[PDB]
């Protein structure tokens, strides 16, 4: 909103049970937000209870650091993505037993579809693949070399209506499987996301009009920043990368992209996530360096009134 999102209050700190050095690398809230899902640098996934702070579960998910976590709204499936080891992404079931349903071998990034999460879109370098959650079949493949821009942090993604895909700067019509537009390059890393309002497209510092393809805004503060919208999509969270992780995060107005506030946590922010109720703010904070031989990455919880 306006005022509530300029102050956040620390309440608790989540730390790995039996580690001399905690190593959380990703965070996501449970499907019904009773749990905090915390992937660690060794490829595990530890579930903590948001309220109590107590660890609820621990799963052995990958060979490498967890880089992505996306639960279904259904509460029956979970998407994960690792770092350098194959399979780089996986789709698990949260039913009665935590078992892997389908494997995304070379996909470094994985994401659900937004309509009812019936399809899954993964990214393999510059290429994007679309699969079916039920059978695991690769339904579709989007790529075009003459339009490819080759971001280093490419993440293919659906718009709220899943009729469009943004992959490597290229705007695709899903059902036509034809590239609609190519957003040019002013940045080497961030591939861009869809604004929850489905009006504007946010590619790093550029906010384009999704209808006219005309540049609406330019926000310098979003440079090399990952962007997290609250459920209502009235505010943005900007966290910097390229330690290369910034020790501060910013809040913005999703309407017109003006800065709400800048919070410095004196600690290296690896990741962060909020809830749908917009009550809590989980932040993955790291201290020290390689030469300090201390990279204790911990999850601290804040509250947004």
């Amino acid at each position: 909103r306006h005022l509530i999102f300029s102050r956040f209050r620390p309440i608790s700190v989540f730390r790995e049970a039996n580690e001399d050095e905690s190593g959380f690398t990703c965070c996501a809230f449970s499907a019904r937000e009773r749990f905090l899902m915390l992937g660690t640098c060794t490829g595990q996934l530890k579930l903590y209870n948001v309220f109590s702070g107590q660890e609820e579960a621990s799963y052995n998910c990958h060979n490498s650091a967890i880089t992505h976590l996306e639960p279904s709204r259904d509460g029956s499936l979970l998407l994960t993505s690792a770092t350098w080891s194959q399979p780089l992404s996986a789709l698990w079931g949260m039913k009665s037993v935590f078992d892997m349903k389908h494997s995304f071998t070379e996909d470094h990034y994985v994401e659900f579809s937004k309509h009812s999460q019936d399809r899954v879109i993964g990214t393999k370098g510059d290429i994007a693949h679309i699969y079916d959650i039920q059978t695991g079949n690769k339904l579709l493949t989007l790529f075009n070399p003459d339009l490819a821009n080759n971001y280093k942090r490419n993440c293919a993604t659906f718009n709220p209506t899943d009729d469009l895909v943004l992959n490597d700067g290229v705007l695709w019509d899903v059902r036509s499987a034809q590239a609609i537009h190519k957003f040019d390059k002013f940045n080497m890393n961030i591939s861009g996301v869809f604004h929850p309002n489905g009006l504007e497209v946010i590619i790093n510092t550029e906010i384009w009009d999704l209808r006219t393809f005309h540049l609406l805004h330019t926000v310098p503060a979003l440079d090399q920043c990952r962007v997290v919208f609250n459920h209502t999509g009235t505010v943005m969270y900007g966290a910097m990368l390229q330690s290369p992780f910034g020790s501060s995060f910013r809040t913005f107005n999703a309407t017109d992209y003006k800065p709400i506030a800048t919070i410095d946590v004196k600690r290296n922010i690896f990741d962060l996530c909020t809830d749908t109720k917009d009550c809590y703010l989980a932040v993955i904070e790291n201290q020290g360096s390689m030469d300090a031989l201390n990279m204790d990455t911990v999850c601290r919880l804040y509250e947004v009134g």
Binding site: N18, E19, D20, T42, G43, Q44, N60, C61, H62, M100
Partner: protein, 92 residues
């Protein structure tokens, strides 16, 4: 049931862990630490010796010309260990 590339019982801690690595070989473009590694390989180090080869100094090229009580300026206290570390650096 378990994708098996994952992951042991539970973990090592500092307050209950008291007492094969591979790693890069040959040869001449060796940073000071590829020199420290090679030194520790022989049973040397002696942090007083390596406390600073973090740099006075040495390349993977200043191995065979570092002579013997140049070693005196940088830490290895006794004459004997010094005598077959003088003669730990050859063989190639």
């Amino acid at each position: 049931q378990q994708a098996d590339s994952d992951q042991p019982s539970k973990r090592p801690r500092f307050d209950d862990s008291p007492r094969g690595v591979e790693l890069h070989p040959d040869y001449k473009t060796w940073g000071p630490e590829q020199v420290c590694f090679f030194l520790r390989r022989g049973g040397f180090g002696e942090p007083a010796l390596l406390k600073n080869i973090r740099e006075n100094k040495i390349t993977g090229a200043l191995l065979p010309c570092l002579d013997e009580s140049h070693f005196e300026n940088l830490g290895v206290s006794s004459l004997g260990e010094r005598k077959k570390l003088l003669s730990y650096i050859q063989r190639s």
